[PDB]
Amino acid sequence: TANVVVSNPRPIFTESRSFKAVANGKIYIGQIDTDPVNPANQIPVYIENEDGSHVQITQPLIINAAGKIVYNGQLVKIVTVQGHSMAIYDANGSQVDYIANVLKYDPDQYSIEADKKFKY
Amino acid sequence: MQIKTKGDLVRAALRKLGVASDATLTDVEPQSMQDAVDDLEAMMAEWYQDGKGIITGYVFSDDENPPAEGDDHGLRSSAVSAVFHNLACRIAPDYALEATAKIIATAKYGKELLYKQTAISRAKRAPYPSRMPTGSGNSFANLNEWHYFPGE
Amino acid sequence: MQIKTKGDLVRAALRKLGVASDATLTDVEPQSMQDAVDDLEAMMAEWYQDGKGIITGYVFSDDENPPAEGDDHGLRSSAVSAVFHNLACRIAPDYALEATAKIIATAKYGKELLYKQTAISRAKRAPYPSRMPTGSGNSFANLNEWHYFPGE
Amino acid sequence: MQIKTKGDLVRAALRKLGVASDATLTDVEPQSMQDAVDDLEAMMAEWYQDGKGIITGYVFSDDENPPAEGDDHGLRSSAVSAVFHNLACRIAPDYALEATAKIIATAKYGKELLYKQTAISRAKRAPYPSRMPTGSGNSFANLNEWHYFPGE
Amino acid sequence: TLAVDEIIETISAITPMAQKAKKYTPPAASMQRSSNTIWMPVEQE
Numbered sequence: 001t002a003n004v005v006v007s008n009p010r011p012i013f014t015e016s017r018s019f020k021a022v023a024n025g026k027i028y029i030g031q032i033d034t035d036p037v038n039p040a041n042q043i044p045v046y047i048e049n050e051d052g053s054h055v056q057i058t059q060p061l062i063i064n065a066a067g068k069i070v071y072n073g074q075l076v077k078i079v080t081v082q083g084h085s086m087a088i089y090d091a092n093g094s095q096v097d098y099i100a101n102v103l104k105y106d107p108d109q110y111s112i113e114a115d116k117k118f119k120y
Numbered sequence: 121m122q123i124k125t126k127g128d129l130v131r132a133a134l135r136k137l138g139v140a141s142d143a144t145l146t147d148v149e150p151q152s153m154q155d156a157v158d159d160l161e162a163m164m165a166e167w168y169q170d171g172k173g174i175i176t177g178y179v180f181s182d183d184e185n186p187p188a189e190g191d192d193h194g195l196r197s198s199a200v201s202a203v204f205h206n207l208a209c210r211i212a213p214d215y216a217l218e219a220t221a222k223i224i225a226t227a228k229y230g231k232e233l234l235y236k237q238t239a240i241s242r243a244k245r246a247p248y249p250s251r252m253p254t255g256s257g258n259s260f261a262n263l264n265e266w267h268y269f270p271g272e
Numbered sequence: 273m274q275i276k277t278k279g280d281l282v283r284a285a286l287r288k289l290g291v292a293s294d295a296t297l298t299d300v301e302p303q304s305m306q307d308a309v310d311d312l313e314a315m316m317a318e319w320y321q322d323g324k325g326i327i328t329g330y331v332f333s334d335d336e337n338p339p340a341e342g343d344d345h346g347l348r349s350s351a352v353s354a355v356f357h358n359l360a361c362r363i364a365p366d367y368a369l370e371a372t373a374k375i376i377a378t379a380k381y382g383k384e385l386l387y388k389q390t391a392i393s394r395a396k397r398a399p400y401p402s403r404m405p406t407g408s409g410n411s412f413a414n415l416n417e418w419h420y421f422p423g424e
Numbered sequence: 425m426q427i428k429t430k431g432d433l434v435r436a437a438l439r440k441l442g443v444a445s446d447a448t449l450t451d452v453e454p455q456s457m458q459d460a461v462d463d464l465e466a467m468m469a470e471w472y473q474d475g476k477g478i479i480t481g482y483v484f485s486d487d488e489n490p491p492a493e494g495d496d497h498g499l500r501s502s503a504v505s506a507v508f509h510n511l512a513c514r515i516a517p518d519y520a521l522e523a524t525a526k527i528i529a530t531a532k533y534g535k536e537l538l539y540k541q542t543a544i545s546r547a548k549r550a551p552y553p554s555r556m557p558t559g560s561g562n563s564f565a566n567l568n569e570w571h572y573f574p575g576e
Numbered sequence: 577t578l579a580v581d582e583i584i585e586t587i588s589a590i591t592p593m594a595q596k597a598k599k600y601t602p603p604a605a606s607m608q609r610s611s612n613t614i615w616m617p618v619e620q621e
Contacts, residue, residue, distance in 0.1 A: 008143040023186040092151035151295035158274050162353040264581045303446040310426040317501040366447045
C-alpha cells in the first residue's frame with residue numbers, strides 16, 4: 001500500500017509577472033487582511049529544525065537567489081501559529097505581492113497530533 | 121560629485137523629469153526605480169557597442185549581484201550630466217510625459233561631448249600603401265633595401 | 273541584462289508604451305502577451321531575411337516546446353533596446369495607441385545601430401576582373417604563370 | 425511561427441486594426457472572418473500576377489475545399505508580417521476605419537522587403553547582341569570558336 | 577618595424593662521412609621493374 005508520497009517540501013518564491021525567483025527579497029507575515037510590515041501586526045515565526053525544535057527568529061524573512069528562504073546561509077523550513085497575511089518585497093524594495101489570507105497546514109508530525117487527539 | 125551610484129543617476133533623471141523630486145514633494149517609487157535602472161543599463165549597453173561605441177567607463181552589473189541599484193556606475197566626473205539627461209529623456213515615455221526641450225538639448229550636447237575625445241582618438245590616418253616608394257632622400261630606409269613602404 | 277526572454281522584451285515594450293508594467297493596477301491578458309510575442313517573432317523574421325538581412329542573434333523558437341513565450345531570445349546586450357523599442361512601435365496600434373516621438377526616434381537609432389556592423393562587414397570590394405592583367409612587377413603572379421587575374 | 429493559417433493571418437490583421445482582439449474585449453465574427461479571407465485571396469492573387477508579380481509561396485485554395493479558412497497559407501516566415509499588415513490596410517475601410525500611420529508604414533516596408541529578393545534575381549543582364557564579334561583573343565583558346573556571338 | 581639587411585648566422589654544419597661515401601646511380605629504367613634493388617657479386621673464395 002501507499003503510505004508516503006515522495007515530494008519536496010521546500011517552497012519557491014517567484015515574481016508576479018515573470019518566471020524568476022525573488023532574489024534577496026523579504027517576507028512579512030502578519031494578521032489577516034492587515035499591513036504586515038508594521039511591527040504591531042506581525043506574528044511569531046519559527047524555524048522547524050529536523051528534530052522539531054521550533055526556534056523563533058525575527059520577522060523579515062530573507063529569500064535566497066533560488067526563491068528558498070534562508071537563515072545563517074542554510075535553507076530552513078518556517079512555520080507559524082495562525083492564518084496570516086503575506087507581503088513579499090523585492091531586493092530593491094518594491095512590493096512583489098500582497099495577500100490578505102493565506103493558510104497552509106504542516107504536513108508532517110502526524111504522530112504527535114494523533115497521540116493528542118485519539119483515545120487510549 | 122555626490123552622484124556616484126546607478127540609483128543616484130536614476131534619482132537625478134527622475135528629478136529632472138519632475139516625476140519624483142524633493143521640489144515637488146513626491147518620493148521615488150521602488151517599482152519605478154527598478155524600471156529606470158533597467159532602462160539605464162540597456163541604454164548604456166546600446167551606447168557602448170561591445171567596445172566600439174561611446175566609451176564611458178560605465179560598469180555593467182553581473183547577475184550574481186542581485187540588487188543593481190547602489191552600485192557605483194564607474195563613469196568619469198564629466199559623463200554624469202550626459203548620462204542622466206539622456207536617461208531622463210529615455211524614461212519619460214513610461215509616465216506619458218515628454219522631456220522638455222532644454223532636457224533634450226542638454227542630452228544632445230552631452231552625448232556629443234561624450235564622444236568628442238574618442239572621435240579625436242579614432243581619427244587616425246592610414247599607413248602608406250605598400251606600392252608607394254620611400255624615395256631616395258630617406259637614406260636609412262635604403263641601403264637596407266627598403267625601397268617600398270611596408271603597408272598594411 | 274535583466275531582459276533575458278521574449279516575454280521580458282514584450283513586457284518592456286508594454287512598459288514603454290505605458291499599457292502595463294510592474295507598477296500598474298491593471299495588466300494585460302496572457303492572450304495579449306501571446307499575440308505580442310507572435311508579433312515580435314514575425315518582426316524579427318522580417319528583419320532577418322533568412323540570413324540576408326539584419327543579423328542579431330535572435331533564436332527562433334520551435335513548435336515542439338509548447339510555450340514560445342519564456343524562451344531566451346539570444347540577442348546580445350546591445351540589441352535589446354533597439355528590439356523592444358521597435359516592438360513597442362509595432363504593437364502600439366493594437367491598443368488604439370500611437371508611439372511617441374521619443375520612442376520612434378530611439379527605434380530608428382536602434383535599428384541603424386543594429387545594422388551598422390553587418391554593413392561594415394558587407395562593404396567588401398570585388399575581386400579583379402578575369403581580363404585585368406597582373407602586371408610584370410607582380411612577383412607572386414610571375415611565379416605561377418598568372419598573366420591575367422583569376423575570374424571569380 | 426505561431427501564424428500558420430489564413431485564419432491566423434486574418435486574426436492578426438483584425439487585432440492590428442483594433443476591430444477584434446483581446447486587447448479590446450471584442451470577438452471575431454464569422455462574417456468578418458469570411459470577408460477578410462476573401463479579401464486576402466483577392467489581394468494575394470493581385471500581388472502574384474500569375475507568376476510575374478510578387479513571389480511569396482502563398483498557396484491558393486480550390487473550390488473543392490469548403491472552408492477556405494483552416495488551410496496553411498504556405499508563406500515563408502518573413503512574409504507573414506507584410507501579408508497581414510497589407511491585409512489589415514485593405515480590409516480597414518469595410519468598417520469605415522482607416523489604418524493608422526504605423527500600419528501603413530509597416531505595410532509599405534513589408535511589401536518592399538517582400539520584393540527585394542525577386543528584384544535582385546530579376547536584375548539580369550541580357551547576352552551579347554547578334555552582330556558582335558567575340559574577339560581574336562578567344563579563338564586561340566578555343567580552336568573551334570565562333571567569330572560572332574549568337575544573341576537572343 | 578623596418579628590419580635591417582644582416583642575418584645573424586647561427587649554425588655551421590660539416591659533412592665528412594657523406595662526402596667521402598661513394599655514391600652510385602644504377603639505371604633507373606631497370607630499377608623501376610626491379611623494385612629498387614640491385615645485386616652485386618662477392619669476391620669468390
